[PDB]
Design a protein around this ligand. Structure first.
Ligand code: UAT
Ligand code: UAT
Lengths: 193, 193
């Protein structure tokens, strides 16, 4: 049932590792999943819907990991607190590079992919700002920029920098240096006057 | 001669203001430029080459403005020094939003557009790092992150944040707040321990 669904999704994630969605056919997904083409179309209307689902799963997985962290504070300095938070996204997206890369590209052509990405970005920005505000209310951070604006820029930094590193873009921060790079800019910009 | 060339480029920039390149035909560009379709193909092999040229012009214009600034230091504090530098890109790209938006999209489909963007990003990052290093050699900034890595992340931040603001993406920093937002993160991350 959804064993077939899960097989289709697993096949698609596997094939995206070697090639873009444009070079993957419904027939490729059916064959890998051990079903016919019409059987495929029972579970998904298009290969594009498969990618949307894969992205939805990855994004929700990151979001659920952040909710877990938010409910269960690590017992640590402010630097480590932000590092642990950024790390949810580094590891989650980092563990699904093909889906991340394909899903980012699909933002250009798919309103549903764009709206999905937008919804979660708003959520993560709102959460970032809430934490900055808490830190300001505690007297741990200075009241500099509007928190929501600072959060927006920091979140967009992370999007572009993590994804360029994962894709090995020229230029990009090496993947083994990206977490430390982002944490420094977050801590100095949130705590610095 | 290149009056016809300049007319084709001006027409394309105008039409990109109302619609994507995919909804602009060679015939639209010819007609706007006051020439026939075969006459068009004398100046450019495709509508895609027209966009490449427009982007090349905008990018080189920003780069020439930064070279000017680099040769002629504004007489001012470190915050204003970075603000003046970021502002070259805010105003240059900000004055050509349609070309900026279309050129960024074309990175996905055009190797020449990707390689153009990559070449200048490397250049601007190398320049950013050189300035950070100078500031460190002067004893004006602490030796924190590797300068080239810090420069990379800051430059990618600016790319994503400026372009999201210009496109009115959800989410995005409002255009009237983006310069101050980026300057704060640059100054605190370059000067902060
Ligand atoms: C509590 C914060 C921890 C840091 N954090 C992120 O890294 N940013 C979210 C982000 C946005 C785009 C792509 C990757 C990740 C947001 C929530
Ligand atoms: C001396 C610095 C001043 C600040 N600066 C920029 O804003 N970054 C370059 C950039 C990169 C992508 C898109 C827009 C602009 C780089 C050179």
């Amino acid at each position: 049932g959804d064993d077939r669904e899960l097989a289709i999704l697993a096949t698609a994630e596997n094939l995206l590792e070697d090639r873009p969605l444009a070079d993957i056919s419904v027939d490729d997904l059916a064959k890998g999943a051990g079903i016919s083409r019409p059987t495929f179309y029972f579970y998904f209307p298009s290969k594009e819907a498969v990618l949307l689902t894969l992205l939805d799963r990855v994004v929700n997985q990151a979001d659920m990991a952040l909710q877990t962290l938010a409910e269960n504070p690590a017992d640590t300095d402010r630097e480590n607190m932000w590092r642990t938070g950024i790390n949810v996204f580094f590891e989650t997206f980092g563990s699904h590079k093909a889906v991340t890369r394909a899903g980012q590209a699909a933002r250009a052509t798919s309103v549903e992919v764009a709206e999905l990405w937008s919804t979660f970005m708003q959520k993560w920005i709102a959460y970032t700002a809430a934490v900055i505000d808490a830190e300001r209310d505690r007297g741990a951070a200075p009241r500099t920029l509007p928190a929501h604006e600072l959060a927006t820029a920091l979140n967009l930094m992370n999007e572009r920098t993590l994804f360029a590193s994962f894709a090995g873009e020229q230029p990009s921060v090496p993947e083994a240096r990206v977490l430390d790079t982002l944490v420094h800019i977050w801590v100095t910009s949130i705590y610095g006057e």
